[PDB]
Design a protein around this ligand. Structure first.
Ligand SMILES: Nc1nc2c(ncn2[C@@H]2O[C@H](COP(=O)(O)OP(=O)(O)NP(=O)(O)O)[C@@H](O)[C@H]2O)c(=O)[nH]1
Ligand SMILES: [Mg+2]
Lengths: 476, 171
């Protein structure tokens, strides 16, 4: 009924927007999707039969299944994609809904590889983003959300087809206000920046990410995505470290990253992204690692670690930020006195992950009358039991030679405190050094660092007869 | 959907891998087939041995600029095909170099299969059908079957006898 089916579809198009009749429509013996597909197969070449019908699948695909959705890629997607994109490569409403329904069914992982196959190629999206809408907001928003959804482990198709790693960038710089566009685009670009820089262009991400950092200030998701994309840009193209800064002609992006860290304090994800962002900021600058120190950001990141104490990722990132922050900073005794037991709390809260102790060990080194101050400092320090933490850490990780060097350096530093041969002998340390010495004999740096410790932890208890045979063999 | 397979297809430029790929899945031939610009899927699910087995064909490029890009897939490739031409012994005389790209990255269960392309005019071939059998002197994985994507000759038994032996290598 080529004139009575169209009005039936029009009734459907007005009916579906009410909602909750929708589940009743699905709960039927109609196979309503098969009805619509048989209709569209019956009536090609018709704006009303095509457009109203796609507007329907547009809202109808939101609640079907996961498996019938996974089933539908047999030949159903074929009807929608083919007819609409090809038959109607200039009908803006149709391609908008075609990208929308494709994005909706692009959810299950077993469908994405079908969508990125050779027969079904999801680069019609590019043809749409170029031709059908050079100046339409809704099409660009939906297409870029689709392209972010497509980024599974097959990155070297999307990036190698250079009509994706470029067109998304023009989409970002075109519309700087659509928030969904931002949280799709910058996430996609952070996931593709490594592979696109495995092959100026680096100027493109930076200004867009800076304006996105400033403008959509109140939102969390846009700034998690922004700090992520900026971090993953600068950590792969070092040449534009100089292109930012508080100086004229530059972007004071470090101020914005600090502010974004301060704002959405309750969310661990944005603090994680901002901490990695500030880390890679400080990693290739020396002016930055005095201002934030003067800006008191260390106490704030200590507070944030005190808040998200039950989460190891932000603990890793906070210790890492402290690492790059204190990288070459003179300090008063009150600083390290207040600081250290917080960090040991951070470690004994996450006493299981190598990286959360890798970066923390890499940071804690920097801190190690005024003598009375040092006396109470080290006494409360062993009260916070540094020595048990680090020695059991090396006990926990026969591997990870970085901490197997640095924590040894820490202990050799700490042994100049009067409790050492009391408390390293009220806890025991030397056998771990011996087990690591035989674990790492060939490493010259680990050998020489641990050898002075061997000379600093042998008392009459440890050199009691019989117990020195292993020490003799390992020394010779 | 029982298992998904990870066959790779490598070979020289313009030999016909992209030709031989779609002749097995889309069954379409075209003399004006554009050379592939990187790696590319081609999904296919075939039911065999009481199991609906999925298949991922990864057509690589072959050009020198795209040598490093394709390299990330051999360490995850289950089966490995090598395709080579017949007019061009130079497309044959780099098979150890292809093997150099194989041996540096292939896994333990890589069952090689050689295939001469375009068998329609083998009398004018620069390479004999026995030269590949003379090239078959490699390890026990290496097999051989001359074929043709134009004549659609034995294109299934290229993949089928491979994936049968692959599933035979499977427990
Ligand atoms: N006569 C004949 N010609 C063939 C056959 N297979 C391929 N060709 C020719 O070889 C050309 C090369 O096509 P193609 O599949 O891209 O070769 P390729 O080495 O896989 N190139 P790429 O991997 O870069 O896509 C085809 O266009 C076709 O003219 C065949 O079986 N017979
Ligand atoms: Mg080809």
């Amino acid at each position: 009924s080529v004139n009575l089916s169209v009005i039936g579809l029009k009734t459907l198009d007005l009916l579906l927007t009410s909602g909750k009749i929708t589940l009743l429509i699905l709960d039927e013996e109609s196979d309503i999707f098969m009805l619509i597909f048989d209709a569209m197969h019956s009536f090609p070449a018709n704006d009303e039969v095509q457009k109203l019908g796609c507007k329907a699948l547009h809202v109808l695909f939101e609640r079907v299944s996961e498996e019938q959705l996974t089933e539908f890629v047999e030949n159903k997607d074929y009807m929608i994609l083919l007819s609409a994109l090809t038959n109607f490569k200039d009908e803006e409403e149709i391609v908008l809904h075609v990208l929308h329904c494709l994005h909706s069914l692009a959810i299950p992982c077993n469908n994405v590889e079908v969508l990125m196959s050779g027969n079904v190629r999801c680069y019609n999206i590019v043809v749409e983003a170029m031709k059908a809408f050079p100046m339409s907001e809704r099409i660009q928003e939906v297409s870029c959300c689709l392209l972010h959804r497509l980024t599974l482990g097959n990155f070297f198709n999307i990036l190698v087809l250079n009509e994706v790693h470029e067109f998304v960038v023009k989409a970002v710089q075109q519309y700087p206000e659509n928030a969904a566009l931002q949280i799709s685009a910058l996430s996609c670009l952070a996931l593709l920046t490594e592979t696109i820089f495995l092959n100026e262009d680096k100027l493109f991400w930076l200004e867009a990410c800076y304006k996105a950092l400033t403008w959509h200030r109140k939102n969390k998701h846009v700034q998690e995505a922004a700090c992520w994309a900026l971090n993953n840009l600068l950590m792969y193209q070092n040449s534009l470290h100089e292109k930012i800064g508080d100086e004229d002609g530059h972007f004071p992006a470090h101020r914005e990253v600090m502010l974004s860290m301060l704002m959405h304090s309750s969310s661990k994800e944005v603090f994680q992204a901002s901490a990695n962002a500030l880390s890679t900021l400080l990693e290739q600058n020396v002016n930055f690692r005095k201002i934030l120190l003067s800006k008191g950001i260390h106490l704030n990141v200590l507070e944030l670690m005190q808040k998200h104490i039950h989460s190891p990722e932000v603990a890793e990132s906070g210790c890492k930020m402290l690492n790059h922050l204190f990288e070459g900073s003179n300090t008063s005794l009150d600083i390290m006195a207040a600081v250290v037991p917080k960090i040991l709390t951070v470690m004994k809260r996450h006493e299981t992950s190598l990286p959360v102790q890798l970066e923390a060990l890499r940071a804690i080194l920097h801190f190690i009358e005024f003598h009375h101050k040092l006396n109470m400092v080290k006494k409360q320090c062993f009260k916070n039991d540094i020595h048990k933490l680090v020695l059991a850490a090396l006990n926990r990780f026969i591997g990870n030679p970085g901490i197997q060097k640095c924590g040894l350096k820490v202990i050799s530093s700490i042994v100049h405190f009067p409790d050492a041969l009391e408390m390293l002998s009220l806890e025991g340390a030397m056998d771990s050094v011996l087990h690591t010495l035989q674990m790492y004999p060939d490493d010259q740096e680990i050998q020489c660092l641990g050898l002075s410790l061997i000379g600093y932890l042998i008392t009459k208890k440890n050199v009691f007869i019989g117990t020195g045979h292993l020490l003799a063999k390992i020394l010779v | 959907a029982d298992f998904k397979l990870q066959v790779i297809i490598i070979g020289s430029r313009g030999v016909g891998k992209t030709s031989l790929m779609e002749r097995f899945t889309d069954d379409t031939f075209c003399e004006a087939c554009k050379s592939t610009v990187g790696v590319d899927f081609k999904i296919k699910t075939v039911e065999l041995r009481g199991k609906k087995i999925r298949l991922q064909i990864w057509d690589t490029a072959g050009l020198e600029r795209f040598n490093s890009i394709t390299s990330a897939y051999y360490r995850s490739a289950k089966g490995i095909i090598l395709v080579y031409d017949i007019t061009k012994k130079e497309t044959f005389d780099d098979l150890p170099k292809w093997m150099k790209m194989i041996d540096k990255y292939a896994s333990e269960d890589a069952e090689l299969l050689l295939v001469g392309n375009k068998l329609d005019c083998e009398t004018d071939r620069e390479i004999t059908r026995q030269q590949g059998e003379k090239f078959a002197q490699q390890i026990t994985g290496m097999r051989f079957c001359e074929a043709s994507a134009k004549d659609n000759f034995n294109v299934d038994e290229i993949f089928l006898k491979l994936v049968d032996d692959i599933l035979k290598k499977m427990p």
